[PDB]
Amino acid sequence: GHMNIEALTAELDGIRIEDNEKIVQQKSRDFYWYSPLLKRQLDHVTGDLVVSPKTEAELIRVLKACYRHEVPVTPRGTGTGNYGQAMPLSGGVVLSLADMNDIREIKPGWVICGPGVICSDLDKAARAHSGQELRMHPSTYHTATVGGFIAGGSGGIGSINWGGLRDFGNIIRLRVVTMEQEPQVLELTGEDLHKVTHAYGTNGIITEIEMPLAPAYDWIDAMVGFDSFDTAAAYANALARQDGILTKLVSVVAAPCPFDYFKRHQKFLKEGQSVVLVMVAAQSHDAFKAFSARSGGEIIFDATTAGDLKGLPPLFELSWNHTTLRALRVDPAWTYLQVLYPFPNQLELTAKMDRMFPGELISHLEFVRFDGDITCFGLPLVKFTTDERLEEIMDLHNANGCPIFNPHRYTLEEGGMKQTDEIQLAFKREADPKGLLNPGKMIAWDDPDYDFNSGKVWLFKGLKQA
Amino acid sequence: GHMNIEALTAELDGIRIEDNEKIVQQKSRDFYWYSPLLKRQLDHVTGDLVVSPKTEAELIRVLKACYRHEVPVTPRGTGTGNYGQAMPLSGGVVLSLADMNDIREIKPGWVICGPGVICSDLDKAARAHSGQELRMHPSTYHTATVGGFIAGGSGGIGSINWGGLRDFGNIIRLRVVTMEQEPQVLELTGEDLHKVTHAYGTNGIITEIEMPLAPAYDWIDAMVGFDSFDTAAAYANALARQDGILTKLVSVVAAPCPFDYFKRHQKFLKEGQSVVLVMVAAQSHDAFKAFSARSGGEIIFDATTAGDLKGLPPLFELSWNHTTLRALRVDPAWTYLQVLYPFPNQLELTAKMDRMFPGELISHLEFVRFDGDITCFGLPLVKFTTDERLEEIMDLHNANGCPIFNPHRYTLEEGGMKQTDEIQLAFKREADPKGLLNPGKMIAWDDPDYDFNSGKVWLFKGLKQA
Numbered sequence: 048g049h050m051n052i053e054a055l056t057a058e059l060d061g062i063r064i065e066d067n068e069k070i071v072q073q074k075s076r077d078f079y080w081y082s083p084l085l086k087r088q089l090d091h092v093t094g095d096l097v098v099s100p101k102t103e104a105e106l107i108r109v110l111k112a113c114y115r116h117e118v119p120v121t122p123r124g125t126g127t128g129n130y131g132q133a134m135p136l137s138g139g140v141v142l143s144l145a146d147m148n149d150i151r152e153i154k155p156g157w158v159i160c161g162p163g164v165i166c167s168d169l170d171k172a173a174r175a176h177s178g179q180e181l182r183m184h185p186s187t188y189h190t191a192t193v194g195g196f197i198a199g200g201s202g203g204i205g206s207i208n209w210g211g212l213r214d215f216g217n218i219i220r221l222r223v224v225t226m227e228q229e230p231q232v233l234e235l236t237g238e239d240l241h242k243v244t245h246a247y248g249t250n251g252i253i254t255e256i257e258m259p260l261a262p263a264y265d266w267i268d269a270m271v272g273f274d275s276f277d278t279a280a281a282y283a284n285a286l287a288r289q290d291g292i293l294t295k296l297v298s299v300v301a302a303p304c305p306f307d308y309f310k311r312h313q314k315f316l317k318e319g320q321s322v323v324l325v326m327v328a329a330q331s332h333d334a335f336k337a338f339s340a341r342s343g344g345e346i347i348f349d350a351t352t353a354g355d356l357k358g359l360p361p362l363f364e365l366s367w368n369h370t371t372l373r374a375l376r377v378d379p380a381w382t383y384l385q386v387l388y389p390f391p392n393q394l395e396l397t398a399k400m401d402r403m404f405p406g407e408l409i410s411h412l413e414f415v416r417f418d419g420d421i422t423c424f425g426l427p428l429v430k431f432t433t434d435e436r437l438e439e440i441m442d443l444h445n446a447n448g449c450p451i452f453n454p455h456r457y458t459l460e461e462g463g464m465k466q467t468d469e470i471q472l473a474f475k476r477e478a479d480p481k482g483l484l485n486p487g488k489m490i491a492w493d494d495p496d497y498d499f500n501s502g503k504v505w506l507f508k509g510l511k512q513a
Numbered sequence: 514g515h516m517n518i519e520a521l522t523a524e525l526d527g528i529r530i531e532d533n534e535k536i537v538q539q540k541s542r543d544f545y546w547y548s549p550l551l552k553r554q555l556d557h558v559t560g561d562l563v564v565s566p567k568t569e570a571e572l573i574r575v576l577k578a579c580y581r582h583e584v585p586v587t588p589r590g591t592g593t594g595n596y597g598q599a600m601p602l603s604g605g606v607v608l609s610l611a612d613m614n615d616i617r618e619i620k621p622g623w624v625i626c627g628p629g630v631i632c633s634d635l636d637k638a639a640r641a642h643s644g645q646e647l648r649m650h651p652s653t654y655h656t657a658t659v660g661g662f663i664a665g666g667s668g669g670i671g672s673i674n675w676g677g678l679r680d681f682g683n684i685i686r687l688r689v690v691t692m693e694q695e696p697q698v699l700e701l702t703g704e705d706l707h708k709v710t711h712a713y714g715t716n717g718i719i720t721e722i723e724m725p726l727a728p729a730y731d732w733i734d735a736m737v738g739f740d741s742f743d744t745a746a747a748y749a750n751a752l753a754r755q756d757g758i759l760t761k762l763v764s765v766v767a768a769p770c771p772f773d774y775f776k777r778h779q780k781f782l783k784e785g786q787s788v789v790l791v792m793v794a795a796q797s798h799d800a801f802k803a804f805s806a807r808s809g810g811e812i813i814f815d816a817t818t819a820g821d822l823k824g825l826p827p828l829f830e831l832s833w834n835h836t837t838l839r840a841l842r843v844d845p846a847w848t849y850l851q852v853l854y855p856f857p858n859q860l861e862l863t864a865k866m867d868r869m870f871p872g873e874l875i876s877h878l879e880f881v882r883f884d885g886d887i888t889c890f891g892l893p894l895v896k897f898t899t900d901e902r903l904e905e906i907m908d909l910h911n912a913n914g915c916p917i918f919n920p921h922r923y924t925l926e927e928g929g930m931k932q933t934d935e936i937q938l939a940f941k942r943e944a945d946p947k948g949l950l951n952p953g954k955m956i957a958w959d960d961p962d963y964d965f966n967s968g969k970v971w972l973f974k975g976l977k978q979a
């Protein structure tokens with residue numbers, strides 16, 4: 048690489064650039080620091096400038112100039128990923144897509160928009176236009192971009208209904224611009240768009256998204272309280288299996304996390320109580336109450352009876368990695384794991400892991416559709432002591448039937464979600480022959496000897512088969 | 514010929530009534546004759562009078578008069594049931610709710626309407642009002658009433674998404690009028706409304722329904738063709754488990770049924786071909802094609818590429834018991850079974866039954882959500898020979914792990930769907946102390962020695978818990 052930052056800058060007159068060191072540093076970091084390991088390994092990473100195109104034409108200008116002057120390019124939505132995805136390991140350009148945030152079309156069942164649209168802004172527009180909203184969104188709803196969700200996220204609120212970004216149909220089309228001497232526009236549909244999902248921006252810049260839309264309902268927050276984690280998980284699993292009770296969220300958070308760390312909801316909680324977090328559609332809420340009364344589920348908070356309370360976060364901001372946010376805000380020693388508990392043994396497996404790590408781990412489940420089954424993903428909190436103990440806890444999950452997607456890594460393959468196969472490798476050669484797009488994030492690109500055919504359970508399995 | 518018809522008729526001045534023998538006979542029959550057994554057993558059944566109230570006030574005037582003259586009352590929507598549910602075993606009044614067809618409220622996620630609204634009319638109004646439609650409907654969409662669906666049906670198109678009428682949330686509220694000296698109005702919510710579902714009108718007259726609504730999408734008809742039943746069933750099972758691919762129907766119809774009996778679609782079919790009937794939402798259509806190319810599913814008919822669709826019925830009128838209709842319109846010796854193939858063994862079980870009855874049976878699956886899993890319901894065609902052999906075939910399904918809901922019976926308990934327990938018996942006494950509502954349909958009411966704690970698998974399990 049022969050980086051020439053000065054010549055790059057000269058080629059971008061009319062395009063917004065920022066080179067202030069403090070601002071570049073801030074926009075070179077995400078929420079990697081949720082992992083004590085990443086916090087140490089990536090503490091010294093920073094870019095050289097932030098470039099913020101307003102149009103696809105400006106973006107093409109930027110990529111063309113970066114290819115010519117050999118400046119690395121790391122895409123950034125709003126920098127809320129947890130693994131260092133958007134962090135520029137090699138210096139160079141932080142390519143912000145924040146100003147490519149147009150909403151172009153809203154029709155019955157689908158939307159076309161730019162990558163920088165914030166999830167809640169997209170829903171606000173889809174709701175006003177025709178009472179529609181995203182099928183799923185991360186708990187970073189109000190801050191995260193749709194583009195970064197596709198390229199760096201996996202699922203979240205709404206996965207209970209629709210599965211994950213890993214699944215056919217949850218994305219319709221991705222328009223992607225390559226890093227070639229003449230950047231190419233690709234219109235990826237069918238299976239081809241799934242080369243880009245959760246690829247950390249390593250194989251092209253998403254410049255337009257077509258995604259399905261779902262009906263916007265009056266979603267009712269409710270909490271259900273239990274005296275043990277195992278009875279909370281059994282209730283949550285049963286509720287998730289009620290096919291006529293429409294929910295958007297079914298979470299399990301073990302004591303002592305609710306009472307210790309859900310501070311604004313404390314008056315509804317008590318010491319020793321585990322909680323199930325529920326978002327239930329208004330047309331299903333009476334059925335939800337009747338089911339809960341028949342299933343041992345004491346409703347300790349219900350938005351329909353609590354009144355118009357200000358200062359209460361929505362329950363989804365207590366779920367997914369917002370559960371982690373709340374814990375580490377009070378005690379910074381908390382970190383987390385990412386776990387699958389495979390169907391049909393999720394209740395047995397979550398209980399065994401809960402009992403295996405008393406005190407040191409606090410269980411946290413999110414119920415989701417996964418390959419057509421209802422099961423749960425895990426985001427258990429872990430009290431950090433040493434690097435070695437944290438690796439050991441993950442090793443023991445893997446050895447006890449609970450696949451780990453290691454969040455204490457910053458490469459695609461080590462994170463356990465995006466599998467590298469020959470199709471993934473060939474596509475990056477096509478879309479980034481100089482290796483300028485988010486370098487360092489794909490091990491197989493830097494390692495000719497990499498056994499990318501190893502690993503067991505991949506969340507985003509590769510397209511190659513038979 | 515009930516002895517009190519003259520006196521009853523004199524009390525109904527101003528209410529529309531019909532005593533013409535031929536019309537009363539037509540309005541005393543449903544589609545029971547799909548069963549050769551019921552066709553013979555119920556041949557002599559007819560009412561004395563058809564009474565058609567326009568309003569709940571008129572209905573109450575009718576019930577109060579029938580109660581004081583002890584004339585039985587058998588409710589009727591539009592008489593499309595298959596079990597003789599709406600046929601008056603004791604003569605008396607056929608009480609048609611067809612003129613109680615108010616639609617009084619449509620909101621995001623729910624609708625309030627009268628019992629006589631035809632399903633497709635309900636959707637016509639919900640679509641015009643706010644682009645909504647029913648979650649599920651029988652394949653008799655264009656002729657069946659909503660109230661008769663609730664009291665006499667179980668699910669259908671849309672069950673792939675939502676389960677069935679057996680499930681919490683798929684009905685929100687039933688307003689019911691009792692048969693008492695002074696008829697009472699009950700507003701049944703929570704679990705209480707499930708006393709009335711599939712109870713054949715034996716424990717009160719539904720006068721208002723609140724049901725959930727779902728978004729009205731552009732549903733695309735597609736057929737997928739296979740050289741064998743097993744490969745068709747395996748594909749449909751896989752498609753049904755694609756959580757991001759939104760469908761409204763996933764049916765499997767084994768050869769020779771499609772080529773023999775799907776006449777207007779015959780130009781798309783070939784001899785020996787089994788078919789999977791699909792309704793896929795427009796926003797999932799591309800993913801459906803991509804999944805099907807990846808899953809060995811040849812799309813042989815697609816409403817978006819087929820050119821002129823004139824004269825083609827919708828694919829849902831080739832599904833559920835319309836599959837039976839198409840077959841028996843060509844050969845009247847076909848009848849059917851109703852089967853469950855319990856998860857997770859549905860592929861092995863359907864294949865085992867298919868191999869056990871060559872020629873005599875034609876397999877027909879409908880994939881549905883059932884207790885939180887994806888599995889299939891069966892409506893296999895059976896070539897009628899003798900009553901004895903039809904019983905044996907059903908016994909063999911039951912003995913091989915495939916529960917039968919016997920459609921060749923006219924009582925609630927023998928039909929295998931609506932379980933009787935103490936709560937059902939107590940409620941019938943509460944709503945119909947004289948037993949004038951559809952008499953003879955509930956064995957346990959006529960026979961206090963009848964053992965209602967038998968029967969293994971009930972589609973509509975009772976409310977009594979252990």
Ligand SMILES: Cc1cc2nc3c(=O)[nH]c(=O)nc-3n(C[C@H](O)[C@H](O)[C@H](O)COP(=O)(O)OP(=O)(O)OC[C@H]3O[C@@H](n4cnc5c(N)ncnc54)[C@H](O)[C@@H]3O)c2cc1C
Pocket residue numbers: 077078121122123124125126127128129132133134144162163184185186187190191192193194195196197198199200201202203204246247248249251252253254367368369372485
């Ligand atoms: C408290 C908290 C809770 C969270 N909860 C969830 C959750 O429930 N579910 C979930 O999936 N994630 C969750 N996350 C992670 C993160 O917030 C989301 O995945 C988010 O949607 C990422 O979007 P972003 O705009 O912040 O992307 P960034 O962090 O800016 O970038 C993410 C990745 O996408 C790439 N990228 C961004 N834009 C483009 C583009 N246009 N083209 C190509 N590549 C691009 C970046 O290079 C990077 O590799 C959470 C994070 C926090 C801190």
Ligand SMILES: Cc1cc2nc3c(=O)[nH]c(=O)nc-3n(C[C@H](O)[C@H](O)[C@H](O)COP(=O)(O)OP(=O)(O)OC[C@H]3O[C@@H](n4cnc5c(N)ncnc54)[C@H](O)[C@@H]3O)c2cc1C
Pocket residue numbers: 543544587588589590591592593594595598599610628650651652653656657658659660661662663664665666667668669670712713714715717718719720833834835838951
């Ligand atoms: C070709 C064909 C296909 C079919 N497909 C399906 C299918 O996919 N799914 C399905 O579930 N059914 C199916 N059916 C059965 C039937 O069409 C439906 O269940 C239908 O919705 C019944 O409504 P109806 O108005 O015809 O009721 P009716 O036949 O008039 O009556 C049904 C029952 O409900 C009672 N009843 C009616 N109205 C009231 C009321 N207001 N209050 C109390 N009791 C009342 C009657 O006494 C009777 O017991 C099919 C039938 C045919 C002929």
Ligand SMILES: O=c1[nH]c(=O)c2nccnc2[nH]1
Pocket residue numbers: 127128129130199200201202367368
């Ligand atoms: O950066 C993240 N990417 C993800 O896919 C994710 N998924 C769940 C929770 N946090 C997450 N964080």
Ligand SMILES: O=c1[nH]c(=O)c2nccnc2[nH]1
Pocket residue numbers: 593594595596665666667668833834
């Ligand atoms: O009269 C019917 N009642 C039902 O519940 C039903 N379910 C499926 C198919 N036909 C059916 N016919």
